[PDB]
Design brief:
- Four copies of one chain form a homotetramer.
- Chain A has about 350 residues and is α/β, with parallel strands linked by helices.
- Chain A folds into two domains: about 210 residues, Medium-chain alcohol dehydrogenases, catalytic domain (Quinone Oxidoreductase, Chain A, domain 1), CATH 3.90.180; about 140 residues, NAD(P)-binding Rossmann-like Domain (Rossmann fold, 3-Layer(aba) Sandwich), CATH 3.40.50.
- In chain A, the strands form four sheets. In chain A, strands 3, 5, 6, 9, 10, 18 and 19 form a seven-stranded mixed beta sheet that branches.
- In chain A, helix 5 packs across helix 11 and helix 8 packs parallel to helix 9.
- The longest helix of chain A is centred in the middle third of the chain and has 12 residues.
- Chain A is globular.
- Chain A starts with a strand and ends with a strand.
- Chains in contact: A-B, A-C, A-D, B-C, B-D, C-D.
- Chains A and C meet through loops of A and loops of C.
- The complex binds nicotinamide-adenine-dinucleotide (NAD) (4 copies).
- The site of one nicotinamide-adenine-dinucleotide (NAD) has 26 residues of chain A, from helix 6 and helix 9.
- Chains A, B, C, D: This is L-threonine 3-dehydrogenase.
- Chains A, B, C, D: Catalyzes the NAD(+)-dependent oxidation of L-threonine to 2-amino-3-ketobutyrate. To a lesser extent, also catalyzes the oxidation of L-serine.
- Chains A, B, C, D: It is found in: Cytoplasm.
- Chains A, B, C, D: Belongs to the zinc-containing alcohol dehydrogenase family.
- Chains A, B, C, D: One of its GO terms (biological process) is threonine metabolic process.
Chain lengths: ~350, ~350, ~350, ~350
């Protein structure tokens, strides 16, 4: 029982396509056959071998964590999963019975392990998946969609931290999460969705996903752009995808008084904010968004995917049959050339 | 100066197309040219001269309330409106002074009279409109969509009484309003939208509009149909459009525990319910839905219309030029043969 | 080691103070020295050997489940509890592996065993507690307050299904749950709290607790009473503790439009309701209330106990040392002469 | 007809007690006898003639806004008010047909004038008041309380911008708004209320009002102090009253993940915040609080007052008959030596 695996072998940059033994699932574990698997930020940082990577991941370890996989074997004393179950994985392995956790706050909740970071991930033909992190998918759901579901739940928690149907919306940043964010907003009835993005490639993508207006902040004033569209009102809803200090300010200026803000992008530094003018006098409701509601956000994700109202096709810019072009995948990724990237391990 | 009006002349079934003077705008009023005007269930009641109408309306009066109009003249001291403004009207005239209106509850709060019930409506070439009740439309909005924007506030407040993106939803009743409800729900991300409708014409329109599943409750059980779709979980949102006492019971049985019910349809008699099992051990949140949120609800409808996502044309089944066929139009309604029916008075 | 239990020995009405072998904490279980233990309506139904009781309980079974107790021994696989932890039990053994639970609805979830119904209970010097069901108390919290926290959770979920601070409140029914319901209301700033209650013993107790107005719905119309105190506005919040079909109607009439209703009290029969006038046109929000939110509801009850703002002393009308006057307790309860009744087993 | 007024005569520190004519109410206006009026921080900046006041106020003008007053005469066309009516005023003479007010966001409306900022206030024996701005008091509400109802509105909207019963609360700032903040929060069932204040006079007035723990953020770390009381959990509600840049930060570290912050204190300058650690990974909901909800917030303050639960007497520290000592009043206030200060102009 041998398989191919994308492996962090040493401390250096990069990874290796390695042949390894298929793992045996132990108690509370299932082995799945990987049908589709995608690369996020974090896999990219492990690839790059950045400063965070080095203090966290001790090679050799299998990479990846966004899957659509089929259960093939089940470990001792797993009820609830069986062979043939089609699943996706939640990697935030949570508390259970902490303060935040007893209060059902599983997204802002502490501790135990990350899957794909602290143990082997899923860029392999087969992967061990702890049964308590498994999400069952509908059987007719394309594995390539199913595999977006974790980050798509970042975008659902962001888009829908409050109501959006019929709401003028500003999105800053059209990276992978921001593109999924726009997909979620439009399926939720947001109108106009206005996207502020510096990258011309990323705005092509924004416009494709279904954004109603895109503005280039480096090129034209994104606040003035929003006041042109909203005839002076500003946007009801501002969603922060980038982490760029300037785009916080700017969206904070373009939201309407009494409007609502979702903060997902992570900042490089402390930001300097005129609180009085931008939050207290505007009476904003500002939401900090991290992690995923267990399992409310997954129900929503599953079901907007199944509605066909998510325009996901543009976001998946690259699909790769097996793991042979792994290097090229990560490289086009590093170069800002990819929407989402999907490997199909069994072509 | 003269015009035609569809007019309740005597207390009996029917209406007369009559010739009448064009009213002059007093202070705080404006005069509008009626561009499109739509037929309501209250209008059908008045025409038919049922029990409620016989109590409420004193003949003679101009019928109608649902209006897309252009301002031709403006009373003394109207600052906010001018000649040329394309407006729709909120038929509920204000309170500011009542307990319910001081609380911002205009939907529930009562009466300084109603448009087309207590005063002259807008089945007429021109109509008077208090400035306070006027909502300005974007100039590219078809008047036939603008006209529906009142009963679309009703569908908005039913659909968005709570969150709906990604939520399985049961709609009972696909009359005009229920159809409006399916189209909002689909624009707001509901999935599946399951429709329960005994009329086959009405089921075909639900399907055209965008319902994911239609069921006839006279032909099979609408609850087991729900439970087959939601794997025995039930629907998370149940919207009551019919006012059939049996629909209420079946939807309440069909809602998931923790689920959400909005009630719009008005019942014919008091309804006998199993409180304990259908509402209390299910821990349901149940809202009665009446009127419109002045004006939050109108910003949402306006912008759902401009968004392109409301599938309204399959709902608009009958368009008339002028009023000469008004009898054919009410009688087609009565007979359950219409979606929404639009008069264009100036062709 | 020998203990006293209150035991349901046969079929028959009544119970038996027997002598028994202290049990053996097994896997996932702890054993606790019982400090305070209270009787609820289900203990009364097991004792009256009603119809529900015979189909549910196979004797002999130890009775009770409202407990304040100390861990004196810990079984295999326990980890989160240890000797000396002062705890209360949550009897609804839920399961984070259902649709309702995966959605964090532990109050309307499918249940395993109930503790005190399907297995032995707490009317006894020591008791097996499953350790997943245990809630730890601050150690200076009195055992007889702590005994009350399950039913104070019903009352919290009911009082606080919505905001209540500054809010006119109608409570119908001042049995124990409505007494606790009043205590919570007054600690949460509800004002005036009006209580409708036919028993004068119970209305006396409702004033002691802190109700601002009590009315006898038998001597006087409770609706016109509310319209009096609220100058015709109606109450803003109506909480249903009785389960009297007629109180449902009357509180539905006395609540203001836009008002909020919590349904707790269980009904003898289907109730016939005018939905149009009472629910739809008043635009009510109505909450079916059952069970308790794990573990939000416990946090608030604990904290509200610790505040000393719960006027709970008037509710606890009978305290008994050990189990010897046990028959008198049940009879006083059966005859409606108690608020809550608390045993101290080690006294 | 003559009276006295505390009047901003020239652009400099201070004010003159001057004799002026008694105003005549025109249409839409009411003339009141002023029974009690408190001093606001805004009036303090008009008095000092700080920077803000230099920009906005145009002397000569009567200062003051927080009023309890008795109608003595009604202008042409006032129907809801008559002589003898006991009223309080909302000094936000609101925006009109604007976006924020059309959504019902009156608290954050960007108009129209302000009472005793842009037109004569109420530090006089008589004052003209727009009828639409008038709130009716219960005849038995003492005037010193009715007069604190506007800044009690600030405190209510801040305390109760989400749920608070049973919620561990940190209040930073026990100045006049903060003291009302603590009194509202206790009447709401908040527990514990932990107060952070440098002034010792103020920490004692905090404790008198009903704070459960006070800390000096200059003697010991308030974060650490919050961590010991809440067993390391943090506070569940963080309410910012001071506008101290250091307090904003310490609050945000103090709040539990999933916690709620309400920001009301105005900052002296832009603030530098770790967004990633303090709002985003902690998944806070942050509400900027400004103005008052017209008129829910007034219903709420009225009824909490009338309820006896607001511990208002220790807050009112200085009570003055006529305006003769109006410089002692303002000077004690600057010095930080008052809770709230009331003038009784007709002593
Ligand atoms: N909140 C959390 O705990 C959490 C969880 C997951 C991801 N994230 C964050 O969201 C992620 C977004 O992921 P991604 O895949 O979209 O990263 P990304 O680099 O691919 O996208 C974010 C950026 O937005 C654009 N941008 C940069 N400056 C801008 C500006 N000044 N105005 C407008 N747009 C600007 C950039 O071109 C880039 O697209 C990262 O920001 C990460 O910081 C946060
Ligand atoms: N609640 C409010 O304040 C408010 C305001 C306006 C209108 N309404 C109500 O909602 C409105 C809907 O109006 P419309 O224009 O959609 O009405 P409609 O009368 O034309 O049709 C609704 C019905 O649904 C179907 N139906 C009948 N029995 C059914 C059953 N047992 N199960 C499922 N479906 C069934 C019928 O074919 C019919 O179409 C009316 O009921 C109006 O009374 C309520
Ligand atoms: N919702 C759930 O799943 C759930 C959970 C726990 C308890 N409960 C229910 O609520 C419980 C209350 O328990 P208790 O211990 O307070 O019950 P209880 O029988 O001891 O008291 C309720 C009764 O309310 C009063 N009442 C009767 N008719 C009335 C009327 N017409 N108007 C006003 N009051 C009237 C009676 O005097 C009596 O006080 C019971 O009603 C039980 O039915 C429901
Ligand atoms: N948000 C709105 O739109 C709005 C409207 C009006 C007033 N306000 C604000 O709330 C008010 C606060 O209440 P006030 O009227 O009592 O003013 P206040 O100055 O008396 O209280 C603020 C300060 O709190 C204390 N403080 C200072 N530094 C602190 C620190 N580092 N940590 C903890 N506490 C500290 C000081 O003793 C002083 O009381 C003012 O800040 C005003 O700016 C806001």
């Amino acid at each position: 029982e041998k398989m191919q695996a994308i492996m962090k072998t040493k401390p250096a940059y990069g990874a290796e396509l390695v042949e390894v033994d298929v793992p045996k699932p132990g108690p509370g574990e299932v082995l799945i056959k990987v049908l589709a698997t995608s690369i996020c930020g974090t896999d990219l940082h492990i690839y790059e071998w950045n400063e965070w990577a080095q203090s966290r991941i001790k090679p050799p370890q299998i990479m990846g964590h966004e899957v659509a996989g089929e259960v093939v074997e089940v470990g001792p004393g797993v009820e609830d999963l069986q062979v043939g179950d089609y699943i996706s994985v939640e990697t935030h392995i949570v508390c259970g019975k902490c303060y935040a956790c007893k209060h059902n706050r599983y997204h802002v909740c502490q501790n135990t392990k990350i899957f794909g970071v602290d143990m082997d991930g899923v860029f392999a033909h087969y992967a061990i998946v702890p049964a308590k992190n498994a999400w069952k998918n509908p059987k007719d759901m394309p594995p390539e969609y199913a595999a977006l579901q974790e980050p798509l739940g970042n975008a659902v928690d962001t888009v829908l931290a409050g109501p959006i149907a019929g709401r003028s919306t500003l999105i800053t940043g059209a990276g992978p999460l921001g593109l999924l964010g726009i997909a979620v907003a439009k399926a939720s009835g947001a109108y106009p969705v206005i996207v502020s993005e510096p990258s011309e490639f990323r705005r092509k993508l924004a416009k494709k996903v279904g954004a109603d207006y895109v503005v280039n902040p480096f090129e034209e004033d994104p606040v003035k752009f929003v006041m042109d569209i909203t005839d002076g009102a500003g946007v009801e809803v501002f969603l922060e995808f980038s982490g760029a200090p300037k785009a916080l300010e700017q969206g904070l200026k373009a939201v309407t008084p009494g409007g609502r803000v979702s903060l997902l992008g992570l900042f490089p530094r402390e930001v300097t904010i005129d609180f009085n003018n931008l939050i207290i006098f505007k009476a904003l409701e500002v939401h900090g968004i991290t992690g995923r509601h267990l399992w409310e956000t997954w129900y929503t994700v599953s079901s907007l995917i199944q509605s066909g109202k998510l325009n996901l096709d543009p976001i998946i810019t690259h699909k790769y049959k097996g793991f042979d072009k792994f290097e090229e995948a990560f490289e086009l990724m590093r170069a800002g050339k990819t929407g989402k990237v999907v490997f199909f391990p069994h072509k």
